[PDB]
C-alpha cells in the first residue's frame, strides 16, 4: 500500500510509514517541540507575510514577546526582506522595541547579524530571570534572620546583620549580579558578573582576598549554594567562631 504523508499527517500514521531517518513531518509536533522545549516562555507571532512577487522578495513582520518575566515582559518587532530563492537577507530593520529593554537592545541591535541579536535577547531574558530567582531565593532564606532589600535597580542585594562584639556594630554584605550586553567589546552573548563587598561598621574589607573567597566558594559550590555560603560566612561569624 502506497501512502502520501504531508505536514498535517497523524503521528500514528507517520509511525506506520516510517522507514527513513528524516525528522518527523507532523508540523504540530514540530511546533510543539519548538515552543515548549527549545524556546519556552517566548510568544512569537507572525502577522504579515506579504510578498512583492515581481521582485521575488518576501516581506515578513514578526513579534517576539519574551514572556519569562510575566509581570513586565519586553517585546520586539522585526521586519525581514527575503530573497525567496538563492536566499539572501538583503535588509532587516527593527520596527518597534518595548521601552523597558530599549537601551540595551539599542546598543545591541546597532551591530548587524540579527541571529546573534535574537539569541542574545533570549539569553538576556533567561539570565535576568535566573538573577531574579537567585535573589528571591536568597531573600527568602535570609528574610527573618537578617535585613534584605534590593537596590541599584534590583542588581545588588544588601544583607545587614548586627553583631555582638562591640556596641552592636552592623555587618552589611553587598552582592552584585550585573548583566552586560555586548556593544563595544568578546562574543555576542549577554554576559553576567558576580562580585561581593563586605562592610563591618563602615570599614570596607580588602577586595582582593574577599574576591578570592567569593571565587573559591562559587567555584566549589556553584552559584546558588556558593552565594548561600558567602552569606553564611560574611553574616554569621558567631556560628563559625568555635
Amino acid at each position: 500500500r502506497v501512502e502520501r504523508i504531508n505536514g498535517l499527517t497523524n503521528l500514528q500514521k507517520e509511525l506506520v510509514t516510517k522507514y527513513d531517518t528524516l525528522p518527523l513531518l507532523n508540523m504540530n509536533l514540530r511546533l510543539s517541540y519548538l515552543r515548549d522545549h527549545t524556546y519556552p516562555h517566548l510568544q512569537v507571532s507572525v502577522q504579515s507575510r506579504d510578498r512583492v512577487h515581481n521582485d521575488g522578495i518576501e516581506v515578513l513582520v514578526v513579534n517576539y514577546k519574551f514572556c519569562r518575566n510575566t509581570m513586565n515582559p519586553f517585546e520586539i518587532q522585526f521586519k525581514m526582506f527575503y530573497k525567496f530563492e538563492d536566499s539572501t537577507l538583503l535588509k532587516w530593520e527593527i520596527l518597534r522595541i518595548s521601552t523597558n529593554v530599549r537601551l540595551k537592545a539599542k546598543q545591541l541591535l546597532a551591530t548587524r547579524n540579527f541571529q546573534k541579536c535574537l539569541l542574545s535577547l533570549y539569553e538576556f531574558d533567561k539570565i535576568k530571570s535566573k538573577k531574579t530567582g537567585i535573589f528571591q531565593n536568597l531573600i527568602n532564606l535570609l528574610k527573618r534572620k537578617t535585613r534584605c532589600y534590593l537596590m541599584n535597580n534590583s542588581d545588588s542585594l544588601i544583607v545587614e546583620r548586627v553583631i555582638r562584639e562591640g556596641r552592636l556594630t552592623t555587618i552589611k554584605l553587598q552582592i552584585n549580579f550585573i548583566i552586560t550586553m555586548p556593544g563595544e567589546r568578546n562574543c555576542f552573548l549577554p554576559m553576567s558578573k558576580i562580585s561581593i563587598a563586605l562592610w563591618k561598621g563602615g570599614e570596607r574589607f580588602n577586595q582582593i582576598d574577599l574576591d578570592e573567597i567569593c571565587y573559591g566558594l562559587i567555584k566549589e559550590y556553584g552559584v546558588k549554594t556558593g552565594l548561600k555560603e558567602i552569606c553564611n560566612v560574611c553574616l554569621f561569624p558567631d556560628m563559625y567562631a568555635r
Binding site: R144, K145, V162, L168
Partner: peptide, 20 residues
Amino acid sequence: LQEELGNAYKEIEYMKRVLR
C-alpha cells in the same frame, strides 16, 4: 534560635534609639 536572636537584637536597638 538565630531568628530569636535577631528579634532580640532588634529590640535592643529599639530601646537604645528611644533612649537618650
